[PDB]
């Protein structure tokens, strides 16, 4: 849900799940390349 | 050596240095860091230009690595400190700089995306027909354009050019009776080396005499008061003291003479002989050509042939090609607006 829980993952961890392939990883890399830029942190905690 | 402030250096930071510093600190993969380092060198002291994209992609030597990977990474690089960085074409520059308006800007977000994304090529002249394209009227569009005109361009904030690179002058031309007059302002072994100094000290006194001399002959060759400078050949200065052309051009190329107008020292000896009986070489031709083209075209005449006819009326024997070619150059709008 939302962003953060998605934003921290290594591409080596995300690359292997069904249906992603190499294309969708670069797709989310392009979409999330804008705004957040992040694709990682250890952060702190969560409000919800 | 050490223990003193030798001119060891400063290690300042340019824009590419700083961008690379900014890449070091962001969560790029092994490859993406190679694309990032590949882009930040492509960037210029001017910002906007990231030059050709497909050469960025092809420079990596295939093996996969599509266009989209450099595109995303490229966007994120475009997002680093000086707001709009790199990108291309200024359009996407203003779209990235416009990417963060906080979205709480009234009327600006939408209108600004329409104007800045597309049709901005026609916004150069004025609004006019564009007002009918976007259906906007009055100050609704004018305020958005106030924001677009309030953006600035690219980087050139990092800069790191504190050095103005001053002239320091060399020889002063004290202005006389509507002209110029030169003044030129501004144990046994090492003892034998001392002797060389005597010769260097004797030549140092004549160094100013060469500047005042060649300067006096240069003042006699070209009229100061006259428009531009009277056409002269290096054969005149080579006639006076009997010096070689390359030597005189080298002295005038290294040192720079300060007169009351122009700092411009080696350009006062370079001229053409025109090869015509009816006649200031190319200086007044291009200069006065752009001056005559300055006040002209009541609306949009854009006629270089009329300017060539005006130059032919002055008795310069214009070719209607050479005159138009030299006149239309150096940012001259002439012949371009037609």
Curated annotation (Swiss-Prot), chain A:
Note the SS bond partners.
none
Coiled-coil intervals: none
Q: Which residues carry this modification: N6-acetyllysine?
A: 22-23
Q: How is it modified after translation?
A: Acetylated on Lys-22 and Lys-23 in the presence of glucose. PatZ controls acetylation of Lys-23 but not of Lys-22. (Microbial infection) ADP-ribosylated on both alpha subunits by the phage T4 protein ModA. ADP-ribosylated on only one of the alpha subunits by the phage T4 protein Alt.
User: What job does the chain carry out?
Assistant: DNA-dependent RNA polymerase (RNAP) catalyzes the transcription of DNA into RNA using the four ribonucleoside triphosphates as substrates. This subunit plays an important role in subunit assembly since its dimerization is the first step in the sequential assembly of subunits to form the holoenzyme.
UniProt lists the family membership as follows: Belongs to the RNA polymerase alpha chain family.
Free-text note on domains in this protein's UniProt record: The N-terminal domain is essential for RNAP assembly and basal transcription, whereas the C-terminal domain is involved in interaction with transcriptional regulators (such as CRP) and with upstream promoter elements.
Q: How does it assemble?
A: Homodimer. The RNAP catalytic core consists of 2 alpha, 1 beta, 1 beta' and 1 omega subunit. When a sigma factor is associated with the core the holoenzyme is formed, which can initiate transcription. Both the N- and C-terminus interact with different regions of transcriptional regulator CRP. The rRNA transcription and antitermination complex (rrnTAC) consists of RNAP, NusA, NusB, NusE (rpsJ), NusG, SubB, ribosomal protein S4, DNA and precursor rRNA; S4 is more flexible than other subunits.
Which named protein is this? DNA-directed RNA polymerase subunit alpha
Q: Which gene encodes it?
A: rpoA
């Amino acid at each position: 849900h939302y962003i953060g829980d998605l934003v921290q993952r290594t591409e080596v961890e995300l690359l292997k799940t069904p249906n992603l392939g190499k294309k969708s990883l670069t797709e989310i890399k392009d979409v999330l390349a804008s705004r957040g830029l992040s694709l990682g942190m250890r952060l702190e905690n969560w409000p919800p | 050596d050490d223990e003193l402030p030798v001119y060891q250096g400063e290690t300042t930071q340019t824009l590419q240095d700083y961008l690379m510093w900014q890449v070091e600190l962001t969560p790029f993969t092994d490859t993406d860091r190679a694309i990032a380092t590949s882009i930040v060198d492509a960037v210029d002291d001017t910002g906007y230009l990231t030059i050709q994209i497909e050469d960025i992609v092809d420079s990596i030597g295939d093996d996969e690595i599509g266009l989209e990977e450099v595109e995303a990474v490229l966007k994120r690089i475009q997002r680093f400190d000086p707001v709009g960085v790199a990108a291309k074409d200024l359009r996407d520059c203003l779209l990235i700089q416009l990417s963060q308006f906080a979205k709480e800007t009234p009327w600006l977000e939408e209108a600004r995306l329409i104007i800045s994304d597309h049709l901005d090529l026609l916004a150069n002249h004025d609004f006019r027909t564009l007002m009918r394209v976007t259906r906007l009227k009055e100050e609704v569009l004018k305020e958005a354009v106030n924001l677009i005109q309030s953006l600035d361009x690219x980087x050139x904030x990092x800069x790191x050019x504190x050095x103005x690179x001053x002239x320091x002058x060399x020889x002063x031309x004290x202005x006389x009776x509507x002209x110029x007059x030169x003044x030129x302002x501004x144990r046994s072994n090492l003892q034998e080396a001392r002797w060389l100094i005597k010769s260097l000290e004797s030549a140092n006194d004549t160094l100013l005499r060469v500047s005042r001399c060649i300067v006096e002959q240069q003042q006699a060759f070209f009229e100061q008061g006259e428009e531009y400078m009277k056409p002269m050949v290096l054969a005149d200065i080579a006639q006076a003291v009997e010096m070689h052309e390359s030597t005189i051009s080298r002295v005038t190329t290294q040192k720079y003479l300060h007169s009351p107008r122009g700092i411009x020292x080696x350009x006062x000896x370079x001229x053409x002989x025109x090869x015509x009986x009816x006649x200031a070489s190319s200086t007044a031709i291009r200069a006065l050509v752009k001056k005559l083209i300055a006040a002209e075209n009541p609306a949009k005449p854009l006629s270089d042939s009329k300017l060539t006819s005006m130059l032919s009326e002055q008795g310069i024997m214009v070719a209607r090609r050479t005159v138009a070619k030299y006149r239309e150059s150096l940012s001259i709008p002439p012949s371009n607006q037609r």
